[PDB]
Amino acid sequence: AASPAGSHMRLSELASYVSGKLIGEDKEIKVGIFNTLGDANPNDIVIRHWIDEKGVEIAKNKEVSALITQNPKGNSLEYAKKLKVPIILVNKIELASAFAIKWTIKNFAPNTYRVVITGTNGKSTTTHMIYHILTHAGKKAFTNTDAMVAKLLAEKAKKENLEYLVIEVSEVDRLMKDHAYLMTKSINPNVVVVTNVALDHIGLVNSIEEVFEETSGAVKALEKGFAVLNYDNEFTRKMAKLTNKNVKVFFYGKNCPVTFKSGGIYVNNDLFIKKEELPFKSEYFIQNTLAAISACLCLNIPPDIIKKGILTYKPLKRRFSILCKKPLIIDDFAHNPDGIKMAIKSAKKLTKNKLWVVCAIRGSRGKIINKLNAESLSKTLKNIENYEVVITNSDDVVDNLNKVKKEEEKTFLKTLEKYNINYRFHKKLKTALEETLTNCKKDDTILLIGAQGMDPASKLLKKIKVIPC
Ligand SMILES: O=c1ccn([C@@H]2O[C@H](COP(=O)(O)OP(=O)(O)O)[C@@H](O)[C@H]2O)c(=O)[nH]1
Numbered sequence: 238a239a240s241p242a243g244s245h246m247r248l249s250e251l252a253s254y255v256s257g258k259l260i261g262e263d264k265e266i267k268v269g270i271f272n273t274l275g276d277a278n279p280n281d282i283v284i285r286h287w288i289d290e291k292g293v294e295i296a297k298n299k300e301v302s303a304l305i306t307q308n309p310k311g312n313s314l315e316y317a318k319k320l321k322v323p324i325i326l327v328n329k330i331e332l333a334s335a336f337a338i339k340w341t342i343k344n345f346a347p348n349t350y351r352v353v354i355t356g357t358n359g360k361s362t363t364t365h366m367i368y369h370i371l372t373h374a375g376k377k378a379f380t381n382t383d384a385m386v387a388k389l390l391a392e393k394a395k396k397e398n399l400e401y402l403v404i405e406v407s408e409v410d411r412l413m414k415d416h417a418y419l420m421t422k423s424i425n426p427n428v429v430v431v432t433n434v435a436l437d438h439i440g441l442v443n444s445i446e447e448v449f450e451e452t453s454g455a456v457k458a459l460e461k462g463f464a465v466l467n468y469d470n471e472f473t474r475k476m477a478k479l480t481n482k483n484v485k486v487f488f489y490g491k492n493c494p495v496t497f498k499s500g501g502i503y504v505n506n507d508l509f510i511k512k513e514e515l516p517f518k519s520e521y522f523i524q525n526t527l528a529a530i531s532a533c534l535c536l537n538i539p540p541d542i543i544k545k546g547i548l549t550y551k552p553l554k555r556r557f558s559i560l561c562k563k564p565l566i567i568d569d570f571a572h573n574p575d576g577i578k579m580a581i582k583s584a585k586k587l588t589k590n591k592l593w594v595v596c597a598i599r600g601s602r603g604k605i606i607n608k609l610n611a612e613s614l615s616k617t618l619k620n621i622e623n624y625e626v627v628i629t630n631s632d633d634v635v636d637n638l639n640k641v642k643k644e645e646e647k648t649f650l651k652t653l654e655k656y657n658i659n660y661r662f663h664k665k666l667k668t669a670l671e672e673t674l675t676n677c678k679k680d681d682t683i684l685l686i687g688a689q690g691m692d693p694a695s696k697l698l699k700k701i702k703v704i705p706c
Pocket residue numbers: 273274275276285287288289290291292293295
């Protein structure tokens with residue numbers, strides 16, 4: 238694959254590399270990195286879906302070497318012609334981003350080992366785990382997840398001699414069927430991890446089959462190496478049929494070489510992580526741990542190093558976080574049907590007595606995700622004894638971008654009563670939490686689930702002096 242090297246480029250060649258048309262005079266340009274308009278340094282190239290006259294002016298003032306865009310708005314084209322700002326007009330802007338990744342890897346981090354992580358849920362945790370295992374061992378690594386890939390990669394590569402790229406690839410506004418394929422092709426990873434496919438907002442706007450097909454593109458992009466696939470998720474299990482000839486399928490999950498059983502994690506039927514080292518863990522946590530171990534075995538990381546990384550991993554925020562032990566308070570950002578199912582089942586597995594499930598409606602996200610989330614909560618609790626559901630709008634703690642609308646609250650509560658689910662409702666999160674805390678027993682379990690509506694829970698629970706217990 239022909240990717241240019243060096244800090245100089247011909248504008249018409251750049252245009253060809255990104256499948257675009259140069260608007261302006263061809264010339265050789267000095268190139269910095271691919272950046273955003275807001276951070277662009279002189280000679281940087283900016284890829285931006287939309288541009289307007291003010292953007293063109295900013296690009297001129299920042300001495301951007303070239304602007305690549307799909308939608309020049311207003312008179313920006315003629316304005317850029319006036320200001321002599323080179324514009325490359327593309328029909329499919331993701332081709333430019335893919336070129337930027339490939340070029341950035343080649344020019345700033347060519348000798349790296351690379352892993353791509355995709356899936357509906359668990360992407361960020363799994364990426365974070367893999368990244369932590371490597372950096373805990375002293376390896377220099379880049380990841381695009383926080384606790385434009387080309388931009389972030391260049392910035393870190395300019396600061397250290399990277400050995401590993403650990404890149405999370407997401408599903409998308411319009412679901413593009415080749416998004417994961419093209420991004421994975423541009424990274425050329427040794428290992429692709431797929432955590433799961435599940436119903437989320439993109440699947441609802443499109444379909445779960447189109448999300449599965451888009452996700453599987455990351456596996457189809459592999460011509461060598463390892464596809465690390467969650468056996469316990471039917472969609473990712475199916476992608477084993479989609480691997481190319483020389484790609485090794487590496488299943489993790491039940492009856493797989495990396496597996497969780499008898500409370501512990503086993504590798505090739507040898508005990509690897511004892512149950513003593515996995516207290517108060519969720520289903521997703523275990524599955525993500527199996528994925529991260531599998532990825533690192535496929536990178537030939539010595540097992541003692543994997544294990545040290547696993548034992549020192551610090552989870553991301555609101556990943557089944559234990560806020561209190563008596564009562565057991567669990568804070569989880571579960572926000573789509575599969576996440577809510579796993580959170581409740583994992584909470585029930587740890588529940589001595591009564592299970593309290595406090596759930597914040599996903600305000601300003603539509604009726605359908607809320608109906609299905611309420612559906613998942615209902616079906617999951619139907620096979621569970623000794624529970625109580627507290628639904629909240631969190632009107633007291635959410636901003637206007639996350640406010641629960643009238644139709645969203647109705648469909649959520651309508652679904653609950655449709656399934657004979659006994660529930661209490663409260664507009665305020667403070668009231669939902671207080672009523673739960675004043676009515677629960679010391680040996681109960683309180684599971685808090687939700688997105689932005691539940692983010693303020695732990696800070697609120699501190700104001701009412703229930704944590705630290
Ligand atoms: O076509 C454009 C592109 C960018 N900007 C401004 O340039 C700044 C930086 O834009 P960038 O894409 O770097 O980050 P954003 O704010 O869009 O997330 C923003 O405050 C934008 O308002 C503008 O006025 N017109």
